[PDB]
Amino acid sequence: FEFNIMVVGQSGLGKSTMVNTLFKSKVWKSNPPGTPQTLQLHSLTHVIEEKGVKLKLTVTDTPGFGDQINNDNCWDPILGYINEQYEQYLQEEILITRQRHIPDTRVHCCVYFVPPTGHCLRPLDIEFLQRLCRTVNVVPVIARADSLTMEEREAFRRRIQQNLRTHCIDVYPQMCFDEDINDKILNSKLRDRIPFAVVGADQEHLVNGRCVLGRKTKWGIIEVENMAHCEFPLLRDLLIRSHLQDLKDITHNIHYENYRVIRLN
Numbered sequence: 406f407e408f409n410i411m412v413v414g415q416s417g418l419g420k421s422t423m424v425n426t427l428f429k430s431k432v433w434k435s436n437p438p439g440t441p442q443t444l445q446l447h448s449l450t451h452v453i454e455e456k457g458v459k460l461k462l463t464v465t466d467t468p469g470f471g472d473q474i475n476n477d478n479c480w481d482p483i484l485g486y487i488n489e490q491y492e493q494y495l496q497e498e499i500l501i502t503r504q505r506h507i508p509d510t511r512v513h514c515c516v517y518f519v520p521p522t523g524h525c526l527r528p529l530d531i532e533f534l535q536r537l538c539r540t541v542n543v544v545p546v547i548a549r550a551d552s553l554t555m556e557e558r559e560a561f562r563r564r565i566q567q568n569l570r571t572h573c574i575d576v577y578p579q580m581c582f583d584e585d586i587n588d589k590i591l592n593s594k595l596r597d598r599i600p601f602a603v604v605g606a607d608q609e610h611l612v613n614g615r616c617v618l619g620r621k622t623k624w625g626i627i628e629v630e631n632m633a634h635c636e637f638p639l640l641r642d643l644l645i646r647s648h649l650q651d652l653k654d655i656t657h658n659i660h661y662e663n664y665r666v667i668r669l670n
């Protein structure tokens with residue numbers, strides 16, 4: 406069961422740390438055993454399993470942008486990767502016809518990391534998000550959210566949500582794809598919290614008898630899978646549990662078909 410994720414965002418926002426956090430989550434039956442500034446695109450693939458649901462999960466890690474003087478076209482490698490997977494899938498459909506034998510490398514969701522400035526969406530992130538949402542599912546997150554208080558996280562989230570409407574950035578789950586009243590009720594709860602205020606952690610700690618992922622500070626451990634500490638469980642549950650199939654369905658029937666229709670002509 407193939408599912409492909411990609412992390413995107415400014416350098417130094419915890420993207421690579423979040424990749425390891427996803428694979429090391431204590432909700433999987435078992436975790437794979439065993440980073441600095443990312444210099445190349447690289448994908449990790451591991452068969453993970455939650456109670457009943459087995460997954461071949463791929464997470465593509467990307468070099469961060471926004472450090473040079475001029476960041477024009479810093480979206481090309483990432484957009485290039487996304488369209489390459491659509492191209493491979495289309496060429497496989499042309500050649501072998503039956504999807505049973507086509508490995509699905511298409512990016513089913515992009516997790517876009519927003520700097521926890523507490524202000525509003527930066528023009529560079531707006532430009533990147535507008536280009537990304539045209540071709541792939543995008544779930545934005547407030548990165549390294551432990552640097553904001555709970556109240557600051559919420560106010561920043563509300564401003565980002567306003568910015569997304571102003572610049573017409575339709576992030577996942579898009580309201581136009583709510584197929585039912587049940588979908589509207591469930592997806593409105595998710596849209597209320599997006600962007601999730603996430604914290605990443607690749608280290609495990611023993612806290613009150615529990616082996617948990619966390620960031621150890623002078624004041625204690627920030628437990629990244631604890632809803633009282635951050636909203637990583639919301640991102641994790643969305644991607645792997647509740648909306649995995651919907652993300653793949655939109656990728657196949659909306660984004661990939663848009664690529665297939667255009668390129669075939």
Ligand SMILES: Nc1nc2c(ncn2[C@@H]2O[C@H](COP(=O)(O)OP(=O)(O)NP(=O)(O)O)[C@@H](O)[C@H]2O)c(=O)[nH]1
Nearest residue numbers: 416417418419420421422442443468469549604605
């Ligand atoms: N406070 C805090 N620090 C974090 C968090 N996640 C990662 N960090 C720290 O932030 C730094 C950068 O982490 P990293 O994952 O390498 O960021 P990156 O986005 O992968 N960088 P790049 O794009 O340049 O590879 C490290 O010191 C890491 O320990 C987080 O949720 N909170």
Ligand SMILES: [Mg+2]
Nearest residue numbers: 420421442443
């Ligand atoms: Mg990195």
